[PDB]
Symmetry: C3
């Protein structure tokens, strides 16, 4: 055959055909298509600029580098989220504003398939796009899968508070990609009039963010947030960030006289000079000893008055705005093993007691952000339920998760519903087989777990039972359907109640059935404890 | 009450309220308002670029840094000139393009008070805006006072002689501030139709430079030059200025292949590296031995073809240009103590002889520019009188005070009158009680001594005698009056005649009154000796 | 009397009159006129931007800097080509985009003499326009002589094969210069409507590229490629250029993660650092050990997509374009010394047999580009004649000369004629008395030997036999004659047949007369071998 050559605004791109088991027309895969001028030099800590066009045929057939990050963390995370056979080894570089397209269309003849842009998670500190392969999700549901990349950590979120570096560069890059989709996805047999953005974790948050953003307007028509929203404190910083900006500055060896000089100096820094800082700053890790309130969690989404004019807990009160179908879901055990294992959570002891717990919950401030005077009544309502210690640890994990995703997700759901727009919700309760040999079997539906199903891992990786194969094949149809009509439902699929006043949702998994009031009892509990 | 918040073209500005004995209305003070994008990175050695708008409310409540300069030399000059009880220490930074504002207007009401933009002095090498508190002047004479900082030294006046680095970067910034006042001052209760500029020493010169510049036309409607004008050669480089550049580059450790390579190489140097280079050139201090010509004088205004299209001398010959009220005044003993005290002049024995005076005068070529074969002729007209070593040391000083300010001022003042525009001259004759201890109690009208009766020091510092209080209240009246109507006159004020054909001027002091033909004798003389 | 004062587009320029012994009309000489801004800092590896306008009278009285190149080599070349009295010492600089003018016109009036823009050669690595003095030519044939410069080595030809750095910067310069010519030459007595470009060696290839380039169209009306055309393989990089880039980047100490990264990294390096790399690569020198194929001889012309949309071999096949009188020429013994010497060829023995030559033509792969299976066929065709190991050398040399200048130059002529356009050819056969004392007297008409004739060296230097002086005149008239009407023929000059189907050319030397079929058997044979 002849490699597929799609004509774009900036030039002619070249991909490779990949036939999937059980299909006729192979899928044209494009890896490494630039969507914005490489953010190097004076372009560090600034909005993404349009990319220069090319003279011939760009052979975009290799995996683009992942934005600079913790190479060991990034490779680790890439190994736990991938859906393809073997994980792919990637490189780091400032030049990472790329994306990948998996169109199962017949380029020869005009096509207009729905598009599904995927925003990967990774706490805005790590992660990449190539990690997620759409091949299966593309062919199986006839949708063009697009995976984008955006600057991470310092590169994408360093902010001095003022205007010499408002911040949210990462989120501006996601918006920049979406713009590229709107202007190019058509030549790939996709439809710019039906783009659906969906993410998981940080990516999940980024989604909710772009939703409340005035910039992201008309760039998408449907959104999906998997485990993580905008009301998820940990990723959204509020208040005077100057201190954090200065703290990074000094660490890099930069005078702090004025924000202007600060930003200027960091521009004088190299990639390694900034990768070492990202390391010394120790992000994505809970610092035991030291006042919890001081511990810096991570550089993330901020209020720059551009991408986000106000905080999320503000924009949700207003109705006068653009609304679109929004699917928001969570997992049974978000804080089961993944996160803890990563952030090196102090649980090696086995069980936990009313006293010891109170400490962690407190020291976990950079995550749950809970006032010390609350820890007591907090641990009681959750762990105090039984004298059993082996259940305190579990209830502690179920607790830590209900604060980061539980209540938050539901609160975003109710408002979106109230705002006067289509709203759906789910709860993944399944344990993948592609998990790690080091993950306990007592943990079902951990963090991100739903991804394997969503990205049809059962069809790439081997050793998957027919049960799991049918599950994954199912969630893709729901997802795909939601992408099409904005309503997940269809023929051959269980009924998914629209999250309205009845507050019903779908329990996906072994037995995929509907249910009502998700974490309701819980939300209410925190709707007061968090109000003193 | 509630901190002052004003809306400017670039964003909101948060100020602070300050009260003053005798006035109910609290004066609003804004510190550190940026009138340009921090001239950093490649912006070095280039025109002032418009500031970037902030997205929220900028806190203009801190003292802005002063442009990089001799940290000690600069701090010292600030202690001396300051008009506040307690001097304020300052940080050094390249990011120094800011201005302070003092409005005695109620910002919750429409107000259009005349504006007085002050340009500090310091040989274009040192100085700052935060040094001069506008509080008194403003309240007392009901006007808006704006102290601005402009680029100094290398950063402000480094020229290669050509398009790769014209020069006068500092003068541009000055104008850059005027354009800021014209498009913003209206928000701080200022009338953009009555902007008056007034400087002292180096500031007095530049104020004259704007008067001859096309770029400044329509940015001010009244000017005041205190102890400094454009013909004051020292602060205006003439002839090929390339050599200076090459010697500045060489010192800084730069190549000198071409002009371009030169400018480009300095842009690469660091603030610390140029600051260390500024201290190697030894710019303020007057050398002793060696040949006067080889002696490196200083940087300064230059004929670039933008700010000035030709030497101040020529320019003053054409009246076809627009004209505005100009007030040019000097001080009885300009070279009395202040200047020498810093330049470490060879005065110590308290007495000077004929033979030595000629030798010294010559060693001051960078300050007077007189041929050694002429010195004899001059040293006679002044020192040919009484044969007393003491009266000589005092006469040799009145000698420099004439060749620096005296003659140059009057000629500038005379040429303005000849142009057909309102002119007013003055001579300060008073010794404030705010001087140092190392200052001889026999110097009446030292350099800058008016700066205490102009910025109402008697109402900010302690001790001020009623006489010294009555003086200050009188100058501020004349000054504000000039700024308002372009005429210093008003109620309860002696008559100040216009420097018309009768050549009348004012002798401000304990007992103020009008006179005639100020320094008319020396001018006539010095104009002749310069026959050659 | 007073220096010439011409007013160009970007400003006034001052030059100096210099008369040539004999001529009453003095020639106006200008040196160092910038036709582009200096490609320093961020403008490196980018297209030449228009020069910045100056405000006064720029003195064009010093020789401009020759672009960065090997200092030793750069001098050596300047010494073996210069036609002026005493060689001139030159400085290196990134800022070198300048051209020299030698107008013989009487600037006070309005003259429109023909203009000849000379593009100096040097392998696109070393060279300089100040080397060639045009006082003679401009005077003797009454024409405006121009000597333009253009980025070299890495600085003018580093390409990655993508938009991040397409390449051909040096060519893009030669163009920008030609443009400056069209918009300014008029004020120097020249006729922008009758421009004629010409250059030797790499300079010549540049002519052949402009003529074949669509951008170049309308920037000239006559062309002269002396010893070098666009079909001289060694100068035009075909295939994937990315490999060479990853080689340079690595030698300059850079990361090769992406092309966008390689460039950014090379832009940081100091001009001296890159020069180091230029000396590390070892260009212009024959790699005796290694792989003749992997041994990149020198980066150069490429098919960017801006200047060249396709290989010159695919361009000539299209008569659908703009045609202009072209004069292609070659010398009797091109690879007879100057080249074998500079490259340090192992022919110090003064002889060599077949088993050696066959091995030599191989290592010479970067020049001849002959396969390892053709070596015998080509060796047996040029050396299989005699057995005299000394005369087998002059044939091996003549061999390399035919594949680089011989055949190629002719094929270019045959294609220009056959495309319908005035074509002319010549073979210079003379040994100037200005040759190095190290060049054998047996080598006649070596690379560059015509220069001493074209620029009339016999009139600026001493020791010109009565014969040469005459030759130098004749060729000069021929040249200017071709610049005047695209026809070398005139009065008192041997008839020069147009290179039509009879393939008539002119043999220039001691005895000058036409001939037919130049290198006929040569182009034949060689096209056969290369047919694979
Ligand atoms: C340097 C490399 O090998 N990678 C490839 C890159 C990719 O675009 C980016 O790395 C992202 O995939 O550029 C090409 O695609 C191209 O423009 O022809 C070819 C090249 O092979
Ligand atoms: C030195 C400087 O100018 N930057 C300062 C700005 C100023 O508000 C604006 O610059 C206007 O002065 O913000 C601070 O004052 C602040 O309160 O956080 C600190 C910061 O150093
Ligand atoms: C500006 C510079 O530093 N270069 C030299 C120039 C050259 O003509 C070219 O502009 C650059 O070499 O000549 C000068 O004399 C001039 O008056 O411009 C100054 C200097 O010697
Ligand atoms: C600006 O000053 C106000 C006082 O009115 C204060 O509330 C605010 O914190 C200051 N800005 C910041 C973010 O420090
Ligand atoms: C410029 O050239 C003129 C030529 O006479 C000369 O008078 C002047 O001194 C030169 N300027 C410089 C660079 O010194
Ligand atoms: C790029 O890939 C295409 C498709 O196989 C191939 O034909 C071409 O030679 C390759 N060239 C580059 C740019 O690496």
């Amino acid at each position: 055959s002849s490699p597929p050559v799609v004509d774009t605004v900036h030039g002619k791109v070249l991909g490779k055909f990949v036939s999937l088991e059980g299909f006729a027309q192979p899928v044209a895969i494009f890896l490494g298509i630039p969507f914005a001028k490489p953010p190097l030099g004076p372009l560090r800590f600034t909005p993404p600029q349009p990319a220069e066009p090319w003279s011939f045929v760009k052979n975009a057939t290799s995996y683009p580098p992942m934005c600079t990050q913790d190479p060991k963390a990034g490779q680790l995370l890439s190994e736990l989220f991938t859906n393809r056979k073997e994980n792919i080894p990637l490189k780091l570089s400032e030049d990472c504003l790329y994306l990948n397209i998996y169109t199962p269309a017949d380029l020869t003849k005009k096509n207009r398939l729905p598009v599904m842009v995927w925003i990967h998670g990774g706490g805005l500190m790590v992660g990449a796009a190539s990690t997620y392969d759409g091949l299966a999700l593309a062919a199986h549901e006839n949708v063009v899968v697009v995976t984008i990349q955006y600057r991470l950590g310092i590169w994408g979120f360093f902010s001095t508070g003022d205007e010499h570096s408002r911040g949210n560069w990462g989120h501006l890059d996601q918006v920049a990609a979406l713009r590229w989709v709107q202007d190019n996805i058509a030549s790939f047999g996709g439809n710019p009039g039906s783009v659906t953005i969906f993410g998981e974790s940080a990516g999940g948050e980024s989604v909710s963010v772009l939703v409340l953003s005035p910039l992201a307007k008309n760039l998408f028509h449907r959104a999906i947030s998997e485990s993580g929203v905008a009301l998820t404190s940990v990723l959204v910083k509020k208040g005077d960030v100057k201190p954090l900006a200065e703290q990074i500055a000094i660490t890099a060896g930069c005078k702090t006289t004025t924000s202007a000089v600060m930003v200027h100096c960091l521009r004088q820094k190299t990639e390694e000079e900034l990768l070492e800082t990202t390391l010394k700053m120790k992000f994505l890790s809970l610092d035991l000893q030291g006042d919890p309130r001081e511990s810096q969690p991570l550089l993330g989404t901020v209020i720059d008055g551009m991408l986000l004019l106000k905080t999320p807990e503000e924009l949700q009160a207003e109705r006068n705005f653009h609304t679109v179908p929004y699917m928001v879901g969570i997992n049974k055990q978000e804080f089961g093993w993944l996160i803890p294992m990563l952030m090196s959570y102090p649980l090696s002891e086995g069980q936990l007691d009313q006293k010891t717990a109170m400490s962690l919950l407190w020291k976990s401030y950079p995550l749950v952000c809970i006032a010390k005077e609350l820890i007591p009544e907090a641990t009681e309502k959750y762990l105090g339920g039984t004298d059993d210690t082996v259940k305190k640890k579990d209830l502690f994990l179920d607790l830590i998760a209900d604060v980061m995703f539980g209540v938050p997700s539901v609160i975003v759901a109710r408002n979106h519903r109230d705002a006067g727009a289509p709203t759906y919700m789910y709860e993944f309760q399944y344990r993948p087989s592609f998990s790690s040999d080091m993950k306990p079997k007592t943990v079902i539906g951990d963090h991100g777990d739903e991804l394997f199903s969503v990205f049809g891992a059962p069809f790439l990786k081997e050793g998957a039972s027919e049960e799991e194969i049918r599950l994954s094949k199912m969630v893709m149809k729901f997802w795909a359907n939601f992408a099409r009509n904005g309503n997940p439902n269809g023929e051959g699929l269980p009924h998914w109640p629209e999250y309205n006043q009845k507050e019903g949702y779908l329990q996906i998994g072994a037995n995929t059935q509907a249910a009502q009031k998700l974490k309701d009892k819980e939300v209410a509990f925190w709707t007061n404890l968090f109000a003193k």
